[PDB]
Amino acid sequence: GQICDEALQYAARLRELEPGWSATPGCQLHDAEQLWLDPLRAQTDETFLQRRLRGDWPAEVGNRFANWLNRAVSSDSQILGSPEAAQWSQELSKELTMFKEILEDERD
Amino acid sequence: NAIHIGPFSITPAARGLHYGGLPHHQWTLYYGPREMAIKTLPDSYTSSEVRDEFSDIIAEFVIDARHRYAPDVLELVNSDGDAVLARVAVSRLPEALSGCIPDDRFPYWLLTASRPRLGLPVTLNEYTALAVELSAPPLAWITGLLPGEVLTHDAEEWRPPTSWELRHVVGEGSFTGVSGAAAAALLGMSATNFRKYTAGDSAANRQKISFAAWHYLLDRLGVKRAS
Amino acid sequence: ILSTASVLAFERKLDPSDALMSAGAWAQRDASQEWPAVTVREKSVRGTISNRLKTKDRDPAKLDASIQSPNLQTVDVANLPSDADTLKVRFTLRVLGGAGTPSACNDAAYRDKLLQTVATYVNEQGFAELARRYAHNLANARFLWRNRVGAEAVEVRINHIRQGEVARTWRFDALAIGLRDFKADAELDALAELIASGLSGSGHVLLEVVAFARIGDGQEVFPSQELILDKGDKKGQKSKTLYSVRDAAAIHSQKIGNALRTIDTWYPDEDGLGPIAVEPYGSVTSQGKAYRQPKQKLDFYTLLDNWVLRDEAPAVEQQHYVIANLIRGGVFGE
Amino acid sequence: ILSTASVLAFERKLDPSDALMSAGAWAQRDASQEWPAVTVREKSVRGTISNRLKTKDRDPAKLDASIQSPNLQTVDVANLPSDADTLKVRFTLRVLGGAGTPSACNDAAYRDKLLQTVATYVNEQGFAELARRYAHNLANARFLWRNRVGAEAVEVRINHIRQGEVARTWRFDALAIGLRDFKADAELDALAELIASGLSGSGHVLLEVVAFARIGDGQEVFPSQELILDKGDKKGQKSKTLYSVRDAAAIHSQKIGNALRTIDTWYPDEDGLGPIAVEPYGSVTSQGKAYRQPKQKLDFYTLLDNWVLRDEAPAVEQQHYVIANLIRGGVFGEAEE
């Protein structure tokens, strides 16, 4: 819960810190998650791409955050074969669901 | 006014400077001939402060040399392959190892901890014999910092250690942490007759330690097993 | 005392090339040297949400809102031309021999024991059973995976190429030879004797395998699907990319190799399902299940460990399976 | 009184270049100057679970669940084109000479004692045995490591290049000359004479070695494999990279050099395995074993210290092995591991 709040605060401070949303040279899926972490559309940003970003909320980026959480939490047959690792994954999924709800509350 | 911490030596730069209005000197920390660090410390620093400025670099050297020259680890496992029963830090390998995967034909196996494992089937009595023969002393990593011709058992190839090599193991700043008085008491010798070994040049009444005294001292400090 | 080596690696025998795709008309196949290659092209695709979402959701309004977005993707596709009904797939297969020797091994004693164990297998019987099943999998066009289902007539031309020119030809109707049973035929036995001569190291075998599939005019062929990065946008092959050698649709060589070693009919769970590919814990990814499950003592590792260490040589069918796994190659180690 | 030098370093002789791979058709082997290079491509690989498992695994639910989620990799691959069946591998090789002089040495007494020991070796016999074995390993295309295995016809062209043009040409059938024994042949002995002239310092030897292997159309060739560094990847990155020099698939120079010095037949274990590369404690990585293990007195260092310090000259084949290790070069002395 501290790591989820730290990620939310880092996303909020990164969003407030950058003045514009700058286009990147050859940035696929970094732009893909950065659209979920995006500020408003700028003068360089297109109205069509801004409308496409505003229309769809980035919950799938939250799924990518779950992929980051699976990167953070090491799992194996010692936890998958046991009952405690499933409960730890369920708690991590509940925290990721709360973080995904907080993220999806902004967009859409 | 150089400072000696075991094999390390901290020397000043023989002419100071004025930094921020105050007089300073450059102190160099050497490990033998290799220069490890330079700091610029003020005057009116006592030698304890000069020691505690370089103590962190000395400690990181000790950490890296302890991890780098760590002895090998054999593991006694059962017939499945997992479930370690015992571990033993050896200073040598049992000479009959050749790459094995344990099966259930024998109930006890002795593998290396290194990953393309070598192993041998044992029966808990030859495991005890191998562990008694090949075990490593608690300070075996200091043997990594020694020239290897002062650690040999062949008396024809052995040469006695210098004063700098002797300061790795004997002295208050040494890696064993054993003073010259305690090392004199280990060898059944007077502190003065033992201080004759730690002079540095052969003119100032310095004789060399003998083969038996050096190897028995390495045995008693817990550095080399010396069987 | 003898134990199994901790590193033990075998180079594969039966190296196939990448299978190139080309197109032409039927009965032009005897002049099929200038047939143009099947080009991979791009197209757009936009279909609504067909996947099973979480049911009993009491919100049809979000369903209707999701339906209003077409989710346009871009898809690589490969079709025959409109004036060709025959897909020609060409590759080469090299048979080398020396199937007992590992390329890397720790123990020399285990290496000599395994070498003499494969030697007693070869002295007891040659590679002729395995070569017969490999010649069957060459005979039927199993290496056409989805280009074989729903074909009118598939024909396999196999050229043994001793010098730079053709030394012998075989011609098979690949729908006559089934994908189920292993029959006998004099030309098929001659091909099997050639493959067994290659696998025994008595000769150097290089085969050119051409398969003609009568699918239809402008029909869709199925090359190997590449791995697609999810970094870009909805364009630039966002869903499907097809493998290609230079301006030609192609199949991966390990796809061909998986189809060639589909000879395992000795797995204990069933025999009415037909052959599967030889694998330690012989498993098919289409079913997501593992035959030769190691609780039963019939996986490759337990069989090889009982055969080599304890000298409990298994049944001759399981011996064929173990030698087929050594022909397949692998990394067998801890 | 005379001890070994604490520092002793020898630069290598027999410098090969990187071997570049091109592809063409056989019987165009004389017009192989515009043959296009073999390029390195990528492809995808889906893998099964085909390795050994622990007893913590092999529960059937766990094994089938592992088969449910597969492993997808990208792999660098190199093939011939579908209209070409001949791999061409070209490099250059410099034979230099001066094989006794160390590049760095502590003791001058050890230096000139070692120099006169190599001088008595050269006076007693030339480099003719060593150059004969080196020209053999040039003749059979052993530097094609896996590209030689199962090939229909291998042909080696060696052009000795004196000024900017060809001064002599040799042509060999590499499948005729075995990988097992060192035979005799007059063209091969002329090549051995040239290499022994280079090793003795009497001349300047530059050779250009071209090898042709008839593999087949579209078959897979095997360049050198690089080392991939990825720390916490995306579970579908590259698992195999191949070496390439300007988008041409290539073999490392030290790979070619390890295949050139595969001349050690005098190791005490056996001789039915064949020659191995000359190493101190002569060791093959594929067998995971050290022949010339120093518990027997046939490793490089005990032989060299007996020959130089105590004048116990070994057998003439062990002297061949010691001089081959001095030609190989190395860091000898008290930089010990």
What is the signed CA dihedral for B38, B42, B46, B48, rounded to 10 degrees? -40
Query: What tokens were used for B151?
Result: 């650690």
Over C35-85, what HEC string results?
Answer: CCECCEEEEEECCCCCCCCCCCCCCHHHHHHHHCCCCCEEEEEEECCCCCC
What type of residue is D292? R
**Alpha-carbon distance A23 to nearest alpha carbon in chain D (angstroms):** 24
> In angstroms, rounded to a whole number, what is the distance separating the alpha carbons of residues D18 and D15?
10
C94 touches chain D (CB under 8 A): yes
**Method of determination used here:** cryo-EM
Categorise residue D207: left if φ over 0, alpha if ψ from -120 to 50, beta otherwise.
Answer: beta
Task: Indicate the pairing of strand D166-173 with strand D154-161.
Answer: antiparallel
- Minimal Cα–Cα distance from A93 to chain D, Å? 20
Enter the tokens of residue B102.
Answer: 């344990």
- Cα→Cα distances D107→D4, D102, D103, D111, Å: 8, 11, 12, 6
Rg (alpha carbons) of chain B, rounded to whole number: 23
- D233: nearest CA partner in chain A: A71
Q: In 3-state terms, what secondary structure has residue C96?
A: coil
Look at strands D250-251 and D19-24 and give their pairing: antiparallel
Could you tell me the sign of the dihedral formed by the alpha carbons of B54, B57, B63, B69, in that order? negative
The token pair that represents D334 in the structure block: 């008290």
Residue C326 and residue C318 in contact, taking contact as beta carbons nearer than 8 Å? no
Phi-psi label, residue C236: left if phi above 0, alpha if psi -120 to 50, beta otherwise: left
User: Do residues B50 and B27 lie in contact, with contact meaning Cβ atoms separated by under 8 Å?
Assistant: yes
CB B8 within 8 A of CB B31: yes
CA of residue D36 relative to chain centroid, distance: 25
Q: In the block, which residue shows the tokens 């074995």?
A: D133
Radius of gyration of chain D (CA): 23
- Torsion from C-alpha of D320, D324, D330, D334, nearest 10 degrees: 0
Q: How far apart are CA D46 and CA D122, in angstroms?
A: 58
Domain boundaries, chain D: 1-11+99-126+263-337, 12-98+127-262
- Cβ contacts from A onto D, under 8 A: 9
φ, ψ of residue B74 in degrees (nearest 5): -100, 150
Using DSSP's 3-state secondary structure scheme, residue B8 falls into: strand
The answer to whether the beta carbons of residues D40 and D244 sit under 8 Å apart is yes
Nearest of B122, B88, B94 to residue B108 by alpha carbon: B122
Provide the strand spans (E) within chain B: 3-5, 8-12, 17-19, 22-31, 34-42, 72-77, 84-90, 109-112
> Mutation test of the interface with chain C: which of D75, D219, D222, D269, choosing the one with the most C Cβ atoms within 10 A?
D219
| Number of CB pairs, chain A paired with chain C, less than 8 A apart | 12
User: What distance in Å separates the CA atoms of residue C333 and residue C6, rounded to the nearest whole number?
Assistant: 5
Distance CA D69, CA D249 (A): 34
The encoded tokens of residue D134 equal: 């080196």
- Name the residue type at position C273: L
Report which residue type is found at D156: V
Give me the residue label for tokens 């991966």.
C252
Count the Cβ atoms, other than its own, within 10 Å of residue A42: 13
3-state secondary structure of A64: helix
Place of tokens 């040049």: B201
- B13: CB partners within 8 A, 6+ apart: B25, B26, B27, B28
Closest of C285, C286, C314 to residue C301, by C-alpha: C314
CA gap C88, C39 in Å, rounded: 13
Classify residue D10 as exposed, middle or buried by CB count within 10 Å of its CB (0-12, 13-18, 19+): buried
How far is it, in rounded angstroms, from Cα D306 to Cα D301?
8
Tokens of B132: 């008694």
List the beta bridge partners of residue D92.
Answer: D208
Nearest CB among C11, C164, C253 relative to D26 is that of C164
Among C residues 292-321, those touching chain B with beta carbons less than 8 Å apart: 305, 309-310
Amino acid making up residue A54: R
Report which of B126, B154, B170, B139 is spatially closest to residue B211, judged by C-alpha positions. Answer: B154
Using DSSP bridges, classify how beta strands D71-77 and D238-240 pair: parallel, antiparallel or unpaired.
Answer: parallel
Rounded Cα–Cα distance for residues C139 and B97 (Å): 49
The structure tokens listed for B81 are 């392959």
In chain D, residues 115-144 whose CB comes closer than 8 Å to chain C: none
Resolution of the entry in angstroms: 3.0
**D143 to C330, D149, D224, D253, D257: CA distances (angstroms):** 24, 11, 11, 10, 8
Written as six digits, the tokens of B198 are 């730690």
- Name the phi and psi angles at B37, rounded to 5: -155, 165
Print the SS3 string covering chain D: CCCCCCEEEECCCCEECCEEEEEECCCCCCCCCCCCECCCEEEEEEECCCCCCCCCCCCHHHHHHHHHCCEEEEEEECECCCCCCEEEEEEEEEECCCCCCCCEECCHHHHHHHHHHHHHHHHHCCCHHHHHHHHHHHHCCCCCCCCCCCCCCEEEEEEEECCCCEEEEEEEECCCCCCCCCCCCHHHHHHHHHHHHHHCCCCCEEEEEEEEEECCCCCECCCCECCCCCCCCCCCCEEECECECCCCEEECHHHHHHHHCCCECCCCCCCCCCCECCCCCCEECCCCEECCCCCCCCCHHHHHHHHHCCCCCCCHHHHHHHHHHHHHCEEEECCCC
Residue pair B79/B106 in contact (Cβ under 8 Å)? The answer is: yes
Q: Is some CB atom of chain C closer than 8 A to the CB atom of A28?
A: yes
Q: How many helices (H) and strands (E) does chain C have?
A: 7, 15
Q: How far apart are CA C228 and CA C240, in angstroms?
A: 7
Task: Report the distance separating Cα C24 and Cα C211, nearest Å.
Answer: 12
What is the H or E stretch that residue A106 is in? Answer: helix A84-106
Distance of alpha carbon C185 from alpha carbon C139, whole angstroms:
11
CB count in 10 Å sphere of residue C17? 26
Angle (CA) A94-A98-A101 rounded to 5° is 135
Count CB neighbours of B155 within 10 A. Answer: 9
Give B59's contacts (C-beta < 8 A, 6+ positions apart). Answer: none
